[model samples]
Target: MDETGKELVLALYDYQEKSPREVTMKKGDILTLLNSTNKDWWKVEVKATANDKTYERQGFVPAAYVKKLD
Candidate 1:
């Protein structure tokens, strides 16, 4: 983050799929890093449209699988 306690915007080049966390995505998908206080994982947000409902889907993603742009 550029500042303390601020979120980071990242792009997903590689991601993992998990049950109950059904936001099927691919390369170039957008993700917002919600928190980075935890080293093992990150709280991220991905816009999901499922079951005819669209909302911000919050879940934990492996920090290594995330990417960013210059």
Candidate 2:
């Protein structure tokens, strides 16, 4: 089930990027799924807003840390 381009929301735990290929995300963060070929980790993008500016970031997050948004 490669759910590329799917929108999801971070679940219970906050994730810290442990490598250069990963991105940190807080619980409740909204993310867009990019790749799901790997069951343990999925590539995703996060659009973050700060100081009235919005930016997009991409990286891998643990598959279990996120869920489909309702």
Candidate 3:
């Protein structure tokens, strides 16, 4: 984060489709980078929402076309 951990704004893109019991982030939300190795892999932690449920899965995602949400 620039200073302290603060929420960011973005437009959702190329996000993985989660199960019904998963978190579905909106179009504009702060996507905190949980972990990212490189262009091959990246994980994020998004806050749960009413429209998008959440799953108790580990943090390790593949980054093929996850564009910046602007």
Candidate that would win on lDDT: 2
Which portions of model 3 miss their true places by more than 4 Å?
A: 1-12, 18-29, 50-59, 68-70
RMSD after Cα superposition, model 3 = 6.1
The stretch of ten residues in a row with the least summed lDDT in candidate 2 is 3-12
Candidate-wise lDDT, in order: 0.63, 0.79, 0.47
- Per-residue lDDT over 5-47 for candidate 2, one digit per residue giving the tens place of the 0 to 100 score: 5656555579999888999977887788778778888888987
Q: Cα miss at 25, model 1 (Å)?
A: 4.6
lDDT of predicted model 3? 0.47
Off by over 4 Å in 1: 1-6, 19-25, 50-53, 68-70
Which pairs of residues have clashing backbones in candidate 3?
11-69, 22-53, 22-54, 23-53, 23-54
lDDT of 2 at 9: 55
Q: Report the lDDT tens digits of candidate 3 across residue range 1-70.
A: 2654333334354444464432344454456664544667555566543557764343334454343442
Which structure is stronger by TM-score: 1 or 3? 1
Predicted candidate 1, C-alpha RMSD: 3.9
lDDT of 1 by residue, 1-70 (tens): 4555445556566666664552344577767667777676666778767899987777776666666443
What's model 3's TM-score? 0.40
- What TM-score, to 2 decimals, does candidate 1 have? 0.59
